[PDB]
Amino acid sequence: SVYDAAAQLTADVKKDLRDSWKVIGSDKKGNGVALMTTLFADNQETIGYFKRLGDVSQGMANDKLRGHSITLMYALQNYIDQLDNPDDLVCVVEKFAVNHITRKISAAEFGKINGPIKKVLASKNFGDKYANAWAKLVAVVQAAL
Amino acid sequence: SVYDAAAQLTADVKKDLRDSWKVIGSDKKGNGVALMTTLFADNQETIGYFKRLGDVSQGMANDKLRGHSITLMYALQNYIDQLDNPDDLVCVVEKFAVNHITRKISAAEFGKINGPIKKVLASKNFGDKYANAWAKLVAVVQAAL
Ligand code: HEM
Numbered sequence: 001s002v003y004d005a006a007a008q009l010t011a012d013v014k015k016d017l018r019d020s021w022k023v024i025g026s027d028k029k030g031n032g033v034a035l036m037t038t039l040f041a042d043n044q045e046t047i048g049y050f051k052r053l054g055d056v057s058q059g060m061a062n063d064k065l066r067g068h069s070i071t072l073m074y075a076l077q078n079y080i081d082q083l084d085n086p087d088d089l090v091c092v093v094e095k096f097a098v099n100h101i102t103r104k105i106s107a108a109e110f111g112k113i114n115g116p117i118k119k120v121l122a123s124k125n126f127g128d129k130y131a132n133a134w135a136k137l138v139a140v141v142q143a144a145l
Numbered sequence: 146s147v148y149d150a151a152a153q154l155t156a157d158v159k160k161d162l163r164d165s166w167k168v169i170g171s172d173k174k175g176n177g178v179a180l181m182t183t184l185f186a187d188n189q190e191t192i193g194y195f196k197r198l199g200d201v202s203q204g205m206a207n208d209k210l211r212g213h214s215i216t217l218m219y220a221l222q223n224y225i226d227q228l229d230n231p232d233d234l235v236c237v238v239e240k241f242a243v244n245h246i247t248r249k250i251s252a253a254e255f256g257k258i259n260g261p262i263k264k265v266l267a268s269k270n271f272g273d274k275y276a277n278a279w280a281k282l283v284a285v286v287q288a289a290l
């Protein structure tokens with residue numbers, strides 16, 4: 001269950017998640033856009049899903065993409081803030097899951113975000129230990145897809 | 146015009162929004178649900194739009210409503226954080242506007258949130274002065290609907 005996946009996040013994992021988010025979460029517009037552009041660069045097959053955003057090659061200049069990227073970073077902010085209360089983490093995770101279920105995004109496809117997250121983390125010197133911690137949070141969302 | 150509306154956010158208005166947000170934003174779950182239940186209680190004709198959340202009369206006990214409410218407070222958090230940059234404030238407002246346009250929500254009905262906000266603020270000892278400041282921020286979203 002999603003509850004089982006959340007309830008398993010350990011103190012060491014939450015610690016790594018919070019320490020790293022302190023940095024990558026400080027520049028939501030910059031890191032959010034880089035997050036999306038990297039996804040499009042390494043997984044071109046996903047581009048079609050974001051047709052509403054127009055030409056995503058525009059990057060920062062694309063106001064629709066910029067608005068989306070910033071808002072996505074707040075979804076991650078939401079997750080990070082609910083870490084110490086699985087009950088709340090679960091209800092928010094399930095809320096965003098619906099957003100993706102409606103767009104026919106599978107658990108496997110949603111996991112494609114791990115690559116970009118790993119690279120964004122790396123750009124700030126957060127290694128594999130930190131990439132692994134984030135894959136665990138993403139897995140909580142996958143449990144709901 | 147969303148850009149003209151954004152221009153209405155003067156230094157004094159931005160200050161009042163931040164000061165009051167520091168209090169209201171400290172308890173997103175509690176104040177978020179309070180906002181929603183007050184809306185449903187004072188404007189029962191809007192409950193139909195929230196069919197997906199189930200029985201909203203259950204308030205806090207309703208997982209979907211709680212997840213929705215917390216997330217809603219993060220939308221307001223997003224707005225507050227974009228106050229320094231008008232271009233970014235507009236792109237996020239337009240992003241959330243689409244979320245409501247697709248649900249057939251007009252500027253007029255979106256404005257029904259002013260009642261709940263004034264009441265939630267009043268219970269925290271923030272009067273009309275602060276209620277009006279928030280009305281201006283809400284007015285920015287209305288301009289995009
Ligand atoms: C860290 C992981 C991710 C987070 C936190 C996240 C968050 C969000 C949020 C907040 C929205 C806006 C929901 C709405 O207003 O309808 C969204 C939309 C969307 N997401 Fe994700 N997402 C993530 C990963 C992904 C991945 C990997 C894919 C695709 C493989 C994906 C596909 C979509 C699509 C198609 C939309 C709709 C975009 C639009 O038309 O506006 N998401 N996501």
Ligand code: HEM
Nearest residue numbers: 099191194195197216217220221244248250254255257258
């Ligand atoms: C302070 C003002 C408000 C803010 C910041 C706000 C924010 C949000 C957010 C973030 C969502 C989730 C978007 C999504 O995932 O699709 C949402 C959904 C929604 N909002 Fe609002 N909203 C506000 C006022 C209103 C009002 C006054 C109405 C109704 C008269 C309304 C009707 C809706 C509806 C129908 C949904 C869909 C809920 C669902 O089925 O999940 N909103 N809103």
